Design a protein around this ligand. Structure first.
Ligand SMILES: Nc1ncnc2c1ncn2[C@@H]1O[C@H](COP(=O)(O)OP(=O)(O)OP(=O)(O)O)[C@@H](O)[C@H]1O
Lengths: 355, 336, 272, 63, 114, 166
């Protein structure tokens, strides 16, 4: 029975959950679980964060991107399906998200839970990076479905650059940058001499063409919240100049993408440059799209080949939206696995997945 | 009576083999490798490791005077031996299981699944003793005349036959026969359940075998193609033993799926074992004092199965010390 | 999660905060769908497959009472709609009462049959209540193959739940729960189940059959409203706890292989 | 001249660099934090002509 | 037929009725029916063997098995194991004694016997 | 009451019936498979034993030179218990790659089966593995008991809760 399939993206800190066909996730809260007839006693997400008084036994079930808390994460999916989403799991197909290079073992368990204990009619275990490309198909400057490109996800952890070739991840190349939303929120605090400035980051900042230039433009300064200035363009600069704050990192985001691309098989290299997608809240910055392209065009041309980066309206929750955009379309049911299949062909039938 | 652990080897070792003066020994890493160890300090250390081979190495033997070693494997062939090696193509089509040299290192026999013992004259020749054998040959031993070969297979039968080449030693008048060319059956002498180990006496005119029956059998032949003078089987009350050797013509050592070696003593059951219980009192430092020390698991030197017992030291036809290879890795010098 | 929630938490949480600062289809249990829309001033729509079945029992009325003013022409593809205007919302504690009320949308559309059955089990005041067990028997077809039938008598309001067990494990587990329902000593509502064959009130276009017998006390004016927002959630409270139990076995089983796999990996020898 | 003084409000964050006029000059812009400067004079008697009080804790080239 | 084992069973059956049951075991524990096709002969034998063991007082077991021959032990264990299949748990208690006092080898030999 | 002499006879058997050498075939080109699973060489197979306790519980032991096939028939008395095992057993078997001594499917008319190769009675110690199988037989019965006194536990707590709200 194929009705509105449930979309759930479980994150390293925050879990995005809702229904397909919808514009945006219905809930987004912290992927937490507070513990202490003693398994029914708990509370997930926002509940737990409030119940930290009586027994703050909260333990985030996802470490680094993968589930490392099994029986907590089961207890998390339980309450997320009956408390928040309110959906008899036996009536819906389910689309879930995994990080690049998530070991088949972790898929084989996610299956065991959704089926042999919740009875989910159908299940799908889409790789996150690819869902982010799926979300790029929404905006104007594309008009061509292709699951081949480079995903730049930047949340509040690490900034990932992930190459995707014909549906699958070229994992050998997935290079990261140790700077994200936390780090600009932090750097804009040091310039303000903490949520007191995280707002400042979100509603004043923008990526600019050149620091040396825009600082002279400033001599002709939005003041609210109290005096905001230099930080507006200086803060989001760190992605393109790591040494403004973190003197450990050296290679900037533009050059770092190039590496990823140049360090992949030559026959895919043409496509990865042509389809660069932006993902996560910290790529939401104004002109973050351009100063990634413009800087990369001048970095690639120094070695006639083109390059392109797509900045779409629904960037911040691309994983989820990409899931929704994918799971809504006709052929979806086909690529899922039915609970009644998991029983006829074993768990081995739920180790892989199509596109 | 006194048991000293020489080294506890990393992987399960199925057949120890020491050199002439017992300063070097080889084992089996139950894989394509064969280990070689030299004496460093009080213990032992790694030396060579012989990689050449495809499948899993079975039995190994070290020739005393020649110093050359031979490694048969589930490769269907053997190898003769910093070290230069010679690949010996044994014609048999089913995995080789057992290999022992020759009292004078003249030739060597090789057990197999192909119901054939490969004997090797010397470009290396390989004459195939292939007749009254039915099952996979689990063990073999040479008569002190490099002609008569005892072999015990998995068809509950222990066979004694001739393996005389034209470039071998004829043997004299023996209790086994007079006319013994090649594939000459001297003994059907059998009854057990897989003859795990065969063994001629030091005097040569007697043959003892042990089976998975948890039995040992000293058997004295009578005459060429006649009856048997007396065939004495002894049934034990312990997990069956898989390797024996004659301490003398009147007492035989054997160990196996037990852990300890038992001591049988034939003539016409149990002279002892090998424990660390009884240790009463002496009269050396003071008066009423003196046990023994020099510092939850089975209370034995070994802790898995025994593999083989090979002689280590002794006089003319008498044995004073033997070594034990273990599935647990332990390699022990038992100074009887 | 010990007892299920009666209202749609989304709608509630969605609204309670949309009743704050400045200026999308949801699922619910039992094949229900909700549509919180904005064609500024929010819309909201319910759609039960069985809805028009409940129109006869007086749902279309009870609703025009609760959401009186907020009622609007039902959205195309849906059965019933309210429309809260976020600029002309209620006065300050009542603002967070409309919330629950609107989030109770499903509770309410499915509570008319019960009300107009507690009313007959009062009007019935020398013992032909048989012409009621026959004549005045309401039946909801809320799920796919599962239904609720209820019927008043002079002293009781028997409510019967039909339930299908999708599996072969939930069935056995079901019996273990249901049996413990049928036995309650040292009071309250009495339960009565007989999984094989239904009570002699069949022929209602209708596997397991659970019968609650709501006695006079369990729907007094002082509490009758809670009784409904409770009795109607039975199947789900049962099937949920079967799934919870179905999972505590999982914990108490994955823990067990780890034991064995630790005892096996300890059985391997060492360097020592 | 007018280069490193305009570059100052940005270059001073970075920590790695005929160049020596900027290196041994943009640092002199920082050490220059009523005229009390007493040809280095010019590279300061111009910087004189509040959003420059912040860069006081930004050591150019970390030196 | 060569089922004169059918003349060995009546002795043991009576040796139960009288009192001295162990005497009957010492009787039927000689010349047992080797593996065949005709199990119907062996079944009636086994039936007797387990009936015998069922009424031998526990205190008398260690004394019998200690006196018993190694052929007899290997044989008695051999029937115990064939007895465990459908006969009581008394068999299991015999197995405990005839192993602890006559070694593990008995089972090893039972593992062979064709 | 009779759970002690039963496991005794099982251990005493296994200790003997689980003493295996490395054995290469006489059929397949230089191979080595559990000779008890093929059974195509009577020379190498031993005599199979079963160890009962009652009509309910028992276990058979099929032994060969290089391998043994141990199969258990677990205590089931009703409905709830009959499934409670059939899902513990149906679970364990779905983990037979990590639980290397299990059979993918058990022997016909038995609940679970172990395939112990000579490869196992070398990787771990002769007895440490015997001692384990006994501990397994003890613990499964133990869990099935605990899982039962915890579905009955919840049933009460659930049915009592729902009823009290009225
Ligand atoms: N419009 C915006 N401009 C600049 N920064 C933003 C904007 N929106 C959100 N951010 C920043 O993005 C950071 C993380 O937001 P995001 O939604 O990417 O988290 P996330 O996707 O949950 O991360 P993860 O998936 O790694 O858990 C926050 O620190 C936030 O300040």
């Amino acid at each position: 029975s194929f009705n509105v399939p449930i979309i759930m993206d479980n994150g390293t800190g925050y879990s995005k959950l809702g229904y397909a066909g919808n514009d945006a996730p219905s809930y987004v809260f912290p992927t937490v679980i507070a513990t202490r007839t003693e398994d029914l006693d708990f509370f997930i997400g926002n509940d737990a964060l409030k119940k930290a008084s009586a027994g703050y036994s909260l333990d985030y079930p996802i470490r680094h991107g993968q589930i490392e808390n099994w029986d907590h994460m089961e207890r998390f999916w339980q309450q997320s399906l009956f408390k928040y989403l309110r959906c008899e799991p036996e009536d819906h197909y389910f689309l879930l998200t995994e990080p690049p290079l998530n070991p088949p073992e972790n898929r084989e368990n996610t299956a065991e839970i959704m089926f042999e204990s919740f009875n989910c009619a159908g299940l799908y275990i889409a790789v996150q990076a690819v869902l982010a490309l799926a979300a790029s198909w929404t905006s104007s400057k594309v008009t061509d479905r292709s699951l081949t490109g480079t995903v730049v996800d930047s949340g509040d952890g690490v900034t990932h650059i992930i190459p995707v070739a014909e549906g699958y991840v070229i994992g050998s190349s997935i290079k990261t940058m140790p700077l994200a939303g936390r780090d600009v929120t932090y750097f804009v605090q040091s310039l303000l001499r903490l949520k007191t400035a995280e707002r400042i980051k979100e509603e004043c900042c923008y990526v600019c063409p050149d620091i040396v230039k825009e600082f002279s433009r400033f001599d002709r300064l939005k003041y609210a919240s109290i005096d905001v200035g230099f930080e507006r363009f200086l803060a989001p600069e760190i992605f393109f100049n790591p040494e403004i704050a973190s003197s450990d990192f050296l290679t900037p985001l533009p050059e770092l993408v190039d590496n990823v691309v140049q360090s992949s098989p030559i026959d895919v290299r043409k496509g990865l440059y042509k389809n660069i997608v932006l993902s996560g809240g910290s790529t939401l910055f104004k002109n973050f799209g351009n100063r990634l392209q413009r800087d990369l065009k001048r970095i690639v041309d120094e070695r006639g080949v083109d390059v392109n980066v797509i900045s779409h309206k629904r960037q911040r929750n691309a994983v989820w939206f990409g899931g929704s955009l994918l799971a809504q379309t006709p052929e979806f049911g086909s690529y899922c696995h039915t609970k009644a299949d998991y029983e006829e062909y074993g768990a081995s039938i739920a180790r892989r997945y199509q596109i | 009576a006194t048991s000293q652990v020489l080294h506890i080897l990393p992987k399960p070792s199925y057949e120890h083999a020491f050199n002439s003066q017992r300063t070097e020994f080889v084992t089996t890493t139950a894989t394509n490798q064969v280990e070689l160890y030299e004496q460093d300090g009080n213990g032992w250390k790694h030396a060579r490791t012989f990689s050449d081979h495809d499948k899993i190495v079975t039995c190994v033997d070290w020739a005393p005077k020649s110093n050359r070693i031979v490694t048969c494997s589930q490769d269907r062939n053997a190898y003769v031996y910093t070290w230069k090696q010679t690949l010996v193509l044994l014609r048999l089509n089913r995995a080789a299981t057992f290999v022992r040299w020759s009292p004078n290192e003249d030739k060597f026999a090789v057990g197999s699944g192909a119901r054939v013992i490969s004997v090797c004259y010397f470009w290396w020749v390989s004459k195939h003793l292939k007749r009254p054998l039915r099952s996979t040959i689990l063990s073999l031993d040479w008569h002190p005349n490099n002609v008569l070969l005892a072999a015990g297979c998995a068809d509950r039968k222990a066979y004694v036959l001739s393996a005389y080449v034209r470039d071998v030693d004829k043997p004299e008048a023996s209790v086994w026969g007079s006319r013994l060319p090649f594939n000459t059956v001297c003994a059907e002498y059998p009854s057990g359940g897989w003859v795990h180990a065969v063994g001629f006496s030091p005097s040569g005119n007697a043959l003892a075998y042990a089976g998975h029956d948890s039995s040992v059998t000293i058997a004295y032949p009578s005459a060429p193609e006649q009856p048997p003078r007396a065939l004495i089987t002894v049934k034990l009350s312990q997990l069956p033993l898989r390797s024996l050797l004659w301490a003398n013509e009147s007492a035989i050592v054997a160990a196996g799926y037990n852990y300890s070696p038992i001591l049988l003593q034939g003539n016409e059951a149990h002279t002892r074992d090998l424990d660390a219980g009884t240790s009463k009192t002496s009269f050396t430092h003071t008066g009423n004092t003196g046990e023994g020390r020099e510092e939850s698991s089975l209370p034995t030197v070994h802790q898995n199965m025994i593999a083989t017992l090979r002689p280590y030291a002794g006089t003319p036809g008498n044995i004073t010390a033997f070594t034990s290879s273990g599935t647990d890795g332990r390699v022990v010098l038992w100074t009887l | 999660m010990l007892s299920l929630d009666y209202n749609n938490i989304f709608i509630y949480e969605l609204l309670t905060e949309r009743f704050s600062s400045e200026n999308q289809v949801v699922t619910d249990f039992d094949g229900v769908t909700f549509h919180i829309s904005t064609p500024t001033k929010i819309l909201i729509s319910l759609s039960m497959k069985c809805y028009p079945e409940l129109v006869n029992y007086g749902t279309l009325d009870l609703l025009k009472q609760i959401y009186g003013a907020y009622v609007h022409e039902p959205e195309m593809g849906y059965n019933f709609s309210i429309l809260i205007d976020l600029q002309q919302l209620p006065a300050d504690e009542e603002k967070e009462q409309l919330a629950m009320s609107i989030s109770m949308l499903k509770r309410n559309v499915l509570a008319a049959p019960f009300h107009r059955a507690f009313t007959k089990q009062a009007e019935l005041a020398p013992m032909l209540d048989k012409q009621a067990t026959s004549q005045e028997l309401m039946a909801i077809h809320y799920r796919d193959e599962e239904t609720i039938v209820l019927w008043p008598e002079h002293d009781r309001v028997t409510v019967v739940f039909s339930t299908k067990f999708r599996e072969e494990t939930d069935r056995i587990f079901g019996k273990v729960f249901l049996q413990e329902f049928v036995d309650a000593r040292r009071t309250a509502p009495q339960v009565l189940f007989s999984y094989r064959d239904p009570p002699l009130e069949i022929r209602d276009i209708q596997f397991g059959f659970v019968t609650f017998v709501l006695f006079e006390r369990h729907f007094t004016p002082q509490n009758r409203e809670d009784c409904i927002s409770h009795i109607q959630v039975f199947r789900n409270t049962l099937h949920f706890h079967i799934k919870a139990s179905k999972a505590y076995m999982h914990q108490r089983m994955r823990k067990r292989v780890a034991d064995f796999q630790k005892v096996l990996n300890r059985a391997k020898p060492d360097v020592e | 001249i007018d280069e490193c003084i305009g570059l100052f409000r940005a270059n001073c964050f970075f920590r790695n660099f005929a160049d020596r006029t900027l290196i041994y000059g943009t640092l002199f812009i920082s050490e220059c934090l009523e005229r009390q400067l007493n040809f280095r004079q010019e590279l300061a008697y111009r910087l004189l002509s509040k959003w420059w009080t912040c860069f006081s804790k930004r050591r150019f080239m970390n030196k | 037929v060569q089922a004169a084992v059918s003349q060995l069973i009546p002795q043991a059956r009576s040796a139960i009725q009288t009192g001295n049951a162990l005497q009957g075991l010492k009787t039927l524990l000689s010349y047992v029916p080797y593996g065949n096709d005709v199990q119907e002969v062996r079944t009636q034998y086994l039936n007797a063997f387990v009936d015998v063991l069922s009424n031998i007082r526990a205190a008398d077991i260690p004394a019998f098995v200690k006196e018993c021959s190694t052929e007899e032990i290997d044989n008695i264990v051999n029937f115990i194991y064939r007895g465990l299949a459908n006969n009581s748990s008394v068999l299991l208690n015999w197995h405990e004694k005839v192993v602890e006092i006559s070694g593990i080898g008995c089972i090893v030999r039972v593992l062979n016997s064709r | 009451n009779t759970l002690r002499p039963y496991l005794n006879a099982v251990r005493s058997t296994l200790t003997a019936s689980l003493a295996l050498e490395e054995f290469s075939s006489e059929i397949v080109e230089r191979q080595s498979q559990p000779e008890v699973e093929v059974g195509r060489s009577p020379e190498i197979l031993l005599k199979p034993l079963v160890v009962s306790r009652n009509e309910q519980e028992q276990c058979l032991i099929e032994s060969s030179v290089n391998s043994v096939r141990f199969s258990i028939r677990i205590k089931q008395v009703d409905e709830i218990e009959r499934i409670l095992v059939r899902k513990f057993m149906q679970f364990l078997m779905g983990r037979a790659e990590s639980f290397f001594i299990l059979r993918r499917k058990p022997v016909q008319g038995y609940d679970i089966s172990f395939l112990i190769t000579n490869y196992h009675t070398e990787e771990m110690l002769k007895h440490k593995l015997v001692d384990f199988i006994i501990e397994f037989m003890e613990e499964v019965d133990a869990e099935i008991s605990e899982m039962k006194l915890f579905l009955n536990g919840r049933a009460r707590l659930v049915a009592e809760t729902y009823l009290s709200c009225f």
